[PDB]
Design a protein around this ligand. Structure first.
Ligand SMILES: [Ca+2]
Lengths: 57, 223
């Protein structure tokens, strides 16, 4: 299963940290709220990192 | 904070915002040069914002001071969330006044049923997203370790406690992490994690500050 196709995962911690995920329905890297712990792999610190890893998934 | 109320400007003068180009976590001022927050709030380049009420506006009592050190507990475990505490040193000392003030560390642990004040600029909705301009507050009780373990089997360590309402409706939420749980004028908890926000049977989980008082004092004094 391609991790780039998984929905973004906020997780259980209570931060409001802005991360990027690849949104395969839209064909672009998008922002979401990450809670600060237990990240899954569709979770990037920049748009450039997300596009490099997941672009075209 | 879900199910809370508007605190009122500068009524919680130990509450800080951690900013990395936007608010991402809270913290608690414990002396003029040091803030306590959560280890999962670690980022390089933190700016600490003191004296805030409306965090989207410049109102006249703010102090914005960069972190010079952001020290995660050496035993923080990013999978189990044990030891979820961080100390931030301010690059210059804050000017203490009625709107910027420290909170005392505990001398003993608090008991189940003790009422506490939890505060922050986190999401105010249990379903959906609304981030407030001004600081929100919630009164909530500490819960027993037995009830906390029942809510979260296999997940609660000796360095965590639950607080809140099992019926749902009142909890900390995303953006509140690192902020204070104050009971009888002592910082007993740090906002840490939960399962959703304000859901039935899923109270918030908080770092148990009373277990770290010796470590906090010695680490601050060694840095
Ligand atoms: Ca302000």
């Amino acid at each position: 299963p391609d991790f780039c196709l998984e929905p973004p995962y906020t997780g259980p911690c209570x931060a409001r940290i802005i991360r990027y995920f690849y949104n395969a329905k839209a064909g672009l890297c998008q922002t979401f709220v990450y809670g600060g712990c237990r990240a899954k792999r569709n979770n990037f610190k920049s748009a450039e990192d997300c596009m490099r890893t997941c672009g075209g998934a | 904070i879900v199910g809370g109320y508007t605190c009122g400007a500068n009524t919680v003068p130990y509450q800080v915002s951690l900013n990395s180009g936007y608010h991402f976590c809270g913290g608690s001022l414990i002396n003029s040069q040091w803030v306590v927050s959560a280890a999962h709030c670690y980022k390089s380049g933190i700016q600490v914002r003191l004296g805030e009420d409306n965090i989207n506006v410049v109102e006249g009592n703010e102090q914005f001071i960069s972190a010079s050190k952001s020290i995660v507990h050496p035993s923080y475990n990013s999978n189990t969330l044990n030891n979820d505490i961080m100390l931030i040193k301010l690059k210059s000392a804050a000017s203490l006044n009625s709107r910027v003030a420290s909170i005392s560390l505990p001398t003993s642990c608090a008991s189940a049923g003790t009422q506490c004040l939890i505060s922050g600029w986190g999401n105010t909705k249990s379903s959906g997203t609304s981030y407030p301009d001004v600081l929100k507050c919630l009164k909530a009780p500490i819960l027993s370790d037995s009830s906390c373990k029942s809510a979260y089997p296999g997940q609660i360590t000796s360095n965590m406690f639950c607080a809140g309402y099992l019926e749902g409706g009142k909890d900390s939420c995303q953006g509140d992490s690192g902020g204070p749980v104050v009971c009888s004028g002592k910082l007993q908890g740090i906002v840490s994690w939960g399962s959703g926000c304000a859901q039935k049977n899923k109270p918030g989980v908080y770092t148990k500050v009373c277990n770290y008082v010796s470590w906090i004092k010695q680490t601050i004094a060694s840095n």
